[PDB]
Amino acid sequence: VHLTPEEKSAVTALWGKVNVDEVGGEALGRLLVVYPWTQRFFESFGDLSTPDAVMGNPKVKAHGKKVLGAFSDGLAHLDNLKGTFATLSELHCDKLHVDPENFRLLGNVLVCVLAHHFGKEFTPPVQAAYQKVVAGVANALAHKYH
Amino acid sequence: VHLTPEEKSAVTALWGKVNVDEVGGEALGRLLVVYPWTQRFFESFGDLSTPDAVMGNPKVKAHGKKVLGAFSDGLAHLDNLKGTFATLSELHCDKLHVDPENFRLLGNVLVCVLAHHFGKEFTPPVQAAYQKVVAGVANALAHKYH
Amino acid sequence: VLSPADKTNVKAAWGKVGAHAGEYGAEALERMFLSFPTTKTYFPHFDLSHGSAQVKGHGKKVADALTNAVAHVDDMPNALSALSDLHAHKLRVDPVNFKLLSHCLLVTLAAHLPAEFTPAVHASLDKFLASVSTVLTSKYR
Amino acid sequence: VLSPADKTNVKAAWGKVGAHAGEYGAEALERMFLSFPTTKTYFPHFDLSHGSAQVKGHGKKVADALTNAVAHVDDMPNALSALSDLHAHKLRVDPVNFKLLSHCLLVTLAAHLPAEFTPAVHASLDKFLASVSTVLTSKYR
Ligand code: HEM
Ligand code: HEM
Ligand code: HEM
Ligand code: HEM
User: Fold this and answer.
1) Could you tell me which CATH number the domain at A1-146 has?
2) 3-state helix, strand, coil in chain A (%, to 5)
3) Do A97 and C141 touch (CB under 8 A)?
4) Interchain touch A–B (≥3 Cβ pairs closer than 8 Å)
5) Residue D36: what are its φ and ψ, rounded to 5°?
6) In this complex, which chains have at least 3 CB pairs below 8 Å with chain B?
7) CA dihedral D116, D120, D123, D129 (to 10 degrees)
8) Are A93 and C41 an interchain contact pair (Cβ–Cβ within 8 Å)?
9) A131 vs D35: CB contact, 8 Å cut-off?
10) Does ligand 3 have an atom closer than 6 angstroms to the CB of C36?
11) Does the domain made of D1-141 have the CATH classification 2.170.190.11?
12) Rounded to whole angstroms, how far apart are CA atoms C135 and D85?
């Protein structure tokens, strides 16, 4: 997408401070807590039927990891998401069947989780820049949808 | 945007058939009926204060032909809706102060109006095509916004 | 919050449907899958080919649930409790989709009703598919 | 609906909030202006530099309204009915932008309440701002 110099720079800098596997776990799980119909893709994973259960469910937290890790990598191709994400887009349409509304729901719980993590370091300007990033990644996920 | 040429024909085909005028008054009107908070922009137009009143209001009708004329316009030029609409984009930010979300609403009302007017000629496929165009054209009008 | 007017409008309209309500309800799905292709992510079991039994069948079921809402218009919550459970607990369709199919259904009325789709009819039908939508999504969280 | 453990949740995160209500009102709005610029269409009469006193002032007034709907959780209808006729009849803010300002107040709360912002609380406050948004847009048509 396009962000300024100064936009890009402020993404990159927080993210250096992020433990990708803890934040991944957290955002996954609060997805599934605050928007419980997200739960539909996940009922391999075992016991979802409380907020404590969810948050301390292993399969949750691995899956979080693995989605965040991909997002991580992504932040390093922020001139080229849609090519970055093309083949995941794919996947997630034709074999996973994930309605791309969940992408956006994850991106706004990600934002809420940065803020809780960072407190007053997650300024309004820096909010703004990750909103731009989170929207880019949704829409690049969603790009191959048919 | 992205048509298919079997979608670019079914759009060009039908829109040679459109009264601008007529369809344009009808689209605007219904906007204002269905979603009355839209009438926040039009308070200089006259009494809006129930259905026959909005549909037969000559200032509705007039403006309704203005916008569908410009919509017209942009059909000639498909595959660069942003560089068509960027002036008018600017305008409805900095001068008019119109929420872009009103672009989407009229798009949907337009579809409504085509279906009512054309009957069983506005098939599913044609719809689909017209959906991509109006989404296109909303998005092109919102481009300028800051 | 449905006026008396609105009721009327809506009884009327869906009256005028009749017995094509199943046919209609197919063609709204059709319209939805072609125009808003995301919505197909909730039906990877179906064959969504033009003319699909499966869609025709589903579409009947939708229709009938709407005919039941019109019967009922003063106590929709009731009447549509099980399919609110269903969609909450079970199908777990994202609430943005509800919009999508309600516009498709408008679209299909418009196409079939050249007389009875007047402005005022349009507005009550939109408010009424909104309040259907709100009931079906009430127990999600 | 809010359960009654939602209510607990909201009453004892907002009582947290206490006497910063305003300032946090204020930051929410800034957040929304910067992150979603189309909302600024409804403020073209404000100075929207940051720390204006118009923003200030409006943030207070947004947070005392929310303060009044947490006092009256069980009948926020009747509690909000002033400002629902205002936003229906006057202000006419398209309903989408109520999710954008709900977003940014959840972000603000999360930013300032690191102990009380659990999952379970997230969830309840998300719910609570969705309901205040529906009771604000209630009289719109
Ligand atoms: C930032 C947004 C996301 C990113 C980058 C992402 C990325 C990925 C990656 C890298 C995989 C593994 C793919 C290999 O299996 O190939 C995957 C699988 C998965 N994702 Fe996504 N994903 C995202 C959001 C979602 C969301 C929001 C849901 C649903 C709520 C979702 C549901 C799944 C499922 C069910 C699979 C299969 C898991 C295996 O089968 O265990 N993903 N995702
Ligand atoms: C299809 C999308 C649209 C197109 C192409 C479009 C086009 C235009 C054009 C050509 C004009 C005259 C412009 C002075 O002439 O330089 C205009 C103005 C006007 N439009 Fe838009 N318009 C769009 C949709 C909308 C919507 C949905 C709203 C709000 C509901 C809107 C509200 C305005 C208003 C308030 C003006 C000024 C009216 C006279 O000046 O009071 N437009 N538009
Ligand atoms: C007016 C709005 C809606 C009405 C009235 C309604 C009604 C129904 C009925 C009556 C069923 C059958 C429940 C017998 O199975 O019980 C159903 C099933 C289902 N619904 Fe909904 N529905 C609505 C919207 C939606 C939307 C928007 C989606 C997705 C885009 C969705 C996806 C489905 C799925 C996936 C099924 C299962 C289909 C089986 O597999 O056959 N529904 N709905
Ligand atoms: C949580 C939801 C919201 C709450 C509780 C609420 C609250 C309020 C209150 C208390 C007032 C002052 C009314 C004392 O004048 O009469 C007002 C006015 C104002 N509201 Fe809402 N508000 C909400 C959301 C929105 C949203 C989303 C926007 C637009 C993006 C908006 C735009 C406005 C504007 C333009 C005014 C007039 C302000 C100047 O003129 O003062 N509001 N709001």
Assistant:
1) 1.10.490.10
2) 75, 0, 25
3) no
4) no
5) -130, 90
6) C, D
7) -40
8) yes
9) yes
10) no
11) no
12) 23
Closest ligand 4 atom to residue D132 Cα is 1
| CA-based nearest residue to C127, from B108, B35, B31 | B35
Domain coordinates of chain A in residue numbers?
1-146
Looking at chain A, which residue has its C-alpha nearest residue C87?
A37
- Three-state secondary structure string covering chain B: CCCCHHHHHHHHHHHCCCCHHHHHHHHHHHHHHHCHHHHHHCCCCCCCCCHHHHHHCHHHHHHHHHHHHHHHHHHCCCCCHHHHHHHHHHHHHHHCCCCCHHHHHHHHHHHHHHHHHHHHHCCHHHHHHHHHHHHHHHHHHHCCCC
Question: What is d(CA B108, CA B134) in angstroms, rounded to the nearest whole number?
Answer: 8
Experimental method: X-ray
- Distance from the A74 Cα atom to the nearest Cα atom in chain C, whole angstroms: 23
> Quick count: other Cβ atoms within 10 Å of Cβ B72?
14
| Atom from ligand 2 closest to the CA of residue B96 | 35
Decide if A35 and C141 are in contact by the 8 Å CB cutoff.
yes
Residues annotated in a binding site of B: 1-2, 63, 82, 92, 143
Q: Reported resolution in A?
A: 1.7
Smallest Cα–Cα separation from C112: which of B20, B132, B105, B123? B123
Can you read off the two tokens belonging to residue A140? 């690049």
Contact D119/A at CB under 8 A: yes
User: What does D38-64 look like in DSSP terms, one character per residue?
Assistant: GGGGG-TTS--STT-HHHHHHHHHHHH
How many residues appear in chain C? 141
CA distances from B130 to B8, B12, C19 (A): 9, 10, 29
Contact of B49 with chain D, judged by CB distance below 8 Å, is answered with no
Domains of chain C, by residue range, sit at 1-141
Residue located via tokens 């937290």: A61
Residues of A within 8 A of D104 (CB-CB) are 127
Q: How many CB pairs under 8 A join A and C?
A: 35
Q: Within 10 Å of residue C73's Cβ, how many Cβ atoms?
A: 18
**Residue B134 in contact with residue C114, Cβ under 8 Å?**
no
CA distance C62 to D50: 51
**Ligand with minimal distance to B42 CA:** 2
Dig out the tokens for B84 from the structure. 């068509």
Question: Contacts for D57-61 with beta carbons within 8 Å, 24 or more apart?
Answer: D58/D25, D58/D26, D58/D29, D59/D22, D59/D23, D59/D24, D59/D25, D59/D26, D59/D27, D59/D28, D59/D29, D60/D21, D60/D22, D60/D25, D60/D26, D61/D25
